[model samples]
Structures are given as structure tokens and as C-alpha cells.
Target: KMPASRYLTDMTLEEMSRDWFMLMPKQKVAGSLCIKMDQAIMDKTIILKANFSVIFDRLETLILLRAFTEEGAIVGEISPLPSLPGHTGEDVKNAIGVLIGGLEANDNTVRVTETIQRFAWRN
Candidate 1:
């Protein structure tokens, strides 16, 4: 199958557990296991939403591309702006600033990536 080590770089949660034996996660094998923090995001939104719901996309997806592990628990996240038609350079910068501010105080690792690099890395 592709390289076992790469197994953790792609599939979403619902998609990963289906196989059950693909990613060994310890060496024997590995592949991309894309996890979703949808519930967590939703929980945060519900807590921060009374005001933010008015500003953020109703179906906004927070697909993370960064993973730093400590004691087998993911401890860092990297996010970037959606490089879309309406997003301006200034918009990207400010959004990243907000993302950093929200994580830095807690000492969480944030690896910000640019659109092009992230696209190539993902594909």
C-alpha cells in the first residue's frame, strides 16, 4: 500500500477507522489519518458564537495541517486562510494574527502555512 508511514497523512476519522488495520502508528505501518475537531470546534463556536456566528461561516471547516505530539497526544495546530476569491492579503495576515494570538498564550505550537506550500504538501 503506499508507504505505511504516509498513512497518517490523508484519511478523515470516519474514513480511517473503517479499515482498522492500515496505519500501525508505531512502525510496522503508517498512513495519513485526518482527524476532525468538528465537535470541538462546534463546542468552541457555541461558547464563542453568540457574537462570532454573525461573523464566521456557518459551515466553516477547520481542517488542520499541523501535528505535534506529546505523550501520544496532538499538541499543536497550524491553520491558514482559505485562499479564495474574496480573501485579501490583508485578510490573510489578520486572520493568522488572530489564530496565533488565540493559541500562543497557552503555549501551543502553531505552524502557519501559505496556500501554495500547503496545497503541494497536501496533494
Candidate 2:
């Protein structure tokens, strides 16, 4: 595992907040279109779809890269994105936003959180 110390960096609140806003669009986009929010079972379906997309993208990318450079590529198992296990999209969004706010308020913490959160799952 990557050490927390190696990942964390420094940043200001303004910078962190701006990062959140920038990320919001992609999140909203994936949530809005990929999940087809207008349909029945909208919330649950969207969440599942979003999670699947997030998981698949990362795993697929790693596989694709490894295929081209087997020996040089890093090998590891992909884990599911962390959540409260049964949380819904709203739950995730709020939790993530608040956590990001905390990070942005501190430079080192922001680096730590941002590194983890930059993946497709949280995005």
C-alpha cells in the first residue's frame, strides 16, 4: 500500500474548494447521463451504474497498460471504492464533499484526500 505520508501534500482552502467544484461537474455528468436519472429506480440504478463504471474503468485501464508492457507494469488487485457499504448516491456525494472540505482547509490533508479521491469512483 502507498503510505499516507508519501501521498499527502499541502494546499489552501480556496484551492481545495476549487478542486471540489471542478470535480463536481464530472460527478454530476456521470450521475446524470450514465445512470439515466429520469427512469424508475433512478437512485439505486444510478448508484450501481456509477460504481460499475468507476470500477470497470480503472481495472480496464490497468489491464490495457499491462498488456503492452507486462514486465514493466505494476501488478496488483483492484479493490472496490470505499463507502458505507449500503450508502446511496446522495450519501456518497455529501460525505465526499464534506471530507474534501476538511482536506482543503489543510494543505497536507488535502494532498492525502485528493490522491485517494481522484479515481473514477469518487470523481
Candidate 3:
């Protein structure tokens, strides 16, 4: 129920700044990475993984956070670094750089898409 639109209104000024900060495409190289690029199948279901990177735009992050909350995910997982009062993406060298810098390094991560299959079996 925490859509990005509503989420923005709830954020403090400091939190908003951190999540909304932008870097020119030329000024800062985007963040990206991929340890494994492939697909997996379990019980006749196909699973996909993207070993790539994406921009850190405000809309993008908000959309992600929105989906996470809507799906009942623990935002603390993919969001390793605390967002000052706020929040949380990914290129090859860009990707490599992130890996070296310990980006998204945490143990609480989960596959949001797999929730249905997971909980179905669990419950």
C-alpha cells in the first residue's frame, strides 16, 4: 500500500534529499554488476536473473521501494546502506567497482517474485 507517491510525502527532508540526489550522466558513471547471468527452472517454472546495472534515478529507486513494500519485503535487505533518515541499484567496471566497494552487501536479500511460490509451499 506504500506507493512511491505516498512514500515521498512521508519522507523527511534529509531522507528526500538522499533519495532524490542526482548526478549528471557525464559527471558520474552509473553503477552496474553481474556475478552470474543465466536462468533457472524449478518445478516447471522458469526463473531469470539479470547480471547487469541500472541508473540511480529518483523515480527508479522509489518504484523499487514501492514494490518492495507492497510485496511485504524487508527493505533492509537490498538496502544495505542506511539512507540518512531515508533509501536504494547498478555497468561492467561500474559493476566491478560496486563489488569491490561492497555494495548491497547484506544477508537479508530475497527474491520478491518468488514469494508466491515460496509461501505457497510454506503455508
Candidate 4:
């Protein structure tokens, strides 16, 4: 399920009038990269009119990482948390640690292991 805040934000009049139209369920009949499609639609709308600038701003804080383990093995990967603008590297690392802790608490270790395996395979 998508986040409620995202749903609400996407449902706003400005969002709806712009890219939200393209994100309607009907547009995803084939179910290919739903999130990416919605993001692209939203991006297109924003680029066209310059509204919802905050969404893109927030997206920059989101990070992608590919980590490797000892013995040249891959370890894990992660996406950065949504954060306020101008977050420092220490803040980002701490935020990522918290996210990892949460995932570990939830026993999402398989994802971590598989991500590491994938990294090792790729690199």
C-alpha cells in the first residue's frame, strides 16, 4: 500500500489538475512500474507548470546505496529517508541507520541479504 500522506498529497486539487491525472489506476492497466510511472507523470506535470516543487525537493534527500561485505562480497543497499532540506552527511547516515534498525527489528533480513548478494553478483 502507498503511504496515506502520499495519497492525500496526490489527491490535492493542484496535484490532480497536473500530473495526478496520469497516475489514475486506469493508466496502470498493465501494472508496469507503478510507482515509477506515477513519479514520471508527476514529474512531467511539475516540469510543465512548476507546481508541487516540494515533492521534487524532497526526492533529492532520498538516496540509493550499494554496499559490499567483507571478502569482496556484496552486503546490502538502501534508499535514503525523506528529510528536510540541507541535511548533512552525518544526519543522512544516522537516518539510514535508524531505517536499518527498523528493518532489522521487523526481521526484513532476507531483503538485506539478497541485496548484498545482488551487489556481490554485480560487482
- Candidate whose lDDT is highest: 1
lDDT, candidate 3, equals 0.24
lDDT values for all models: 0.29, 0.24, 0.24, 0.27
Q: Can you give the TM-score per candidate against the true fold?
A: 0.28, 0.23, 0.17, 0.25
Q: Is candidate 1 or candidate 2 better by lDDT?
A: 1
User: What's model 1's overall lDDT?
Assistant: 0.29
Candidate 4 C-alpha error for residue 112, in Å: 6.9
Quote the positional error of residue 56 for candidate 1 in Å. Answer: 30
Select the stronger candidate by TM-score from 3 and 4: 4
- Could you tell me how far off, in angstroms, the CA of residue 88 lies in candidate 3 after the best superposition? 12
76: Cα error in model 3, Å: 16
Q: What TM-score does structure 4 among the candidates reach?
A: 0.25
lDDT of 1 at 5: 20
Stretches of candidate 1 exceeding 4 Å from the true structure: 1-85, 114-123
The ten-residue window of minimal lDDT in model 3 covers: 33-42
| lDDT assessment of candidate 2 | 0.24
Candidate 2 lDDT tens digits, 20-54: 11212212222112111111111110001111122
Candidate 2 error regions (>4 Å): 1-85, 108-123
Clashing pairs in 4: 75-116
Error of 3 at 122 (Å): 18
The full ranking of all candidates by lDDT, starting with the best, is 1, 4, 3, 2
Q: Which residue pairs show collisions in model 3? A: 31-90, 32-90, 32-91, 32-95, 53-90, 54-90
